[PDB]
Amino acid sequence: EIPEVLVDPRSRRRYVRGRFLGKGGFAKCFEISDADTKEVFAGKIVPKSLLLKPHQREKMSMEISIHRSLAHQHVVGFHGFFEDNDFVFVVLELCRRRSLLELHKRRKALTEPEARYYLRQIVLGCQYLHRNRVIHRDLKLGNLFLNEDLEVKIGDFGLATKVEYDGERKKTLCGTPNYIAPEVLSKKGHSFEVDVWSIGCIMYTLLVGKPPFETSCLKETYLRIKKNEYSIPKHINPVAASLIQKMLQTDPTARPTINELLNDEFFTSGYIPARLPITCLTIPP
């Protein structure tokens, strides 16, 4: 049912639908080409039939309102949005090298310099989000996208929220995050520190090759989250092992802020490669 050409009535730009990139929740993604400029973007296409109300509709609206306000080297670029009677069309920066998920599925545990290399970028993007009062709330391998230079771009603002006042405690989410922070499990509410928790889980996953808490049953998983039960294998280096611990603490206020995270020994010392070879998507450097 999707149109072969996408016409934006506001901007006057039109886009030819191309290569299917993948589905995700309510949306399919295609490469789209500007018919005039020949520029290529990710066209995210959501049918209104699925925007049939509450958490899904305004998860579309909130997500658009948040994402469009953002502009950073490590955040997926927002190029615009429009709709016809059937679909909502979102025009995004095309990241041609998939995400950290595909990398993880192939590589499992990375070498530490690779992890450092990705994690610095993830932290810098997230720092920019926090400074603009946005909590992402669903950081995970699958929405940490890679461009052709293997630069990380944070996308998927469907669960994101804007801190509207200082000391605000968020109580609700528009869905279920991938890494549930322990404070989300509790009744006490949450703030910026949830993104630091999820970066902890990601850091663990990149270095260890498997997630910190996830077991085969959800009850046991959530219980371990609540109890801070996890184990960092001994082959993990002390500085990295210690930074994972700082992030993966039950008390949100015990964790480093995003800037303290960025300034960790892990990032200011240790090796960061100038270039990762494209081979790193498949075999260790």
């Binding site: 290569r19 041609r96 090298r97 998939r98 595909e102 599925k105 192939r106 052709e148 070879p277 494209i278 081979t279 998507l281 498949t282 075999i283």
Partner: protein, 129 residues
């Protein structure tokens, strides 16, 4: 698991195990969760004997993974010259495009694998592809 076993045997570079799995009827065109085939995994890993074995038993020379890498892309980027030749002899598309529109020659040039560039050119790689 016959597809899975083969994928792992081809990755590990275990030559005898591969022959036995193929003789057992293992799918030479098995795919893993990011679209890698035994041929991909043998190519990227430099397992020359296995590449030839797979191709002789009709493995899809131009199968593309989640990135759009063919086994030729993966051999070219990792510098495995003998495999690049083999794949070419079995009709691998020299100008196959991944999802960035890169041919194996682009990828090899970027990794500094110049002898590969040279062979790919001899086999008719188009620089302006």
């Amino acid at each position: 698991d016959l597809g899975k076993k083969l994928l792992e045997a081809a990755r590990a570079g275990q030559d005898d195990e591969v022959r036995i799995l193929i003789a057992n009827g293992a799918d030479v065109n098995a795919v893993d969760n990011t679209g890698l085939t035994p041929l991909h995994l043998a190519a990227v890993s430099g397992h020359l004997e296995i590449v030839e074995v797979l191709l002789k038993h009709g493995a899809d020379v131009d199968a593309a993974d989640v990135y759009g890498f063919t086994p030729l892309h993966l051999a070219a980027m990792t510098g495995h010259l003998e495999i690049v030749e083999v794949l070419l002899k079995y009709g691998a598309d020299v100008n196959a495009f991944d999802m960035t529109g890169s041919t194996p020659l682009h990828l090899a040039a970027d990794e500094g694998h110049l002898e590969i560039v040279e062979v790919l050119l001899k086999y008719g790689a188009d620089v302006n592809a």
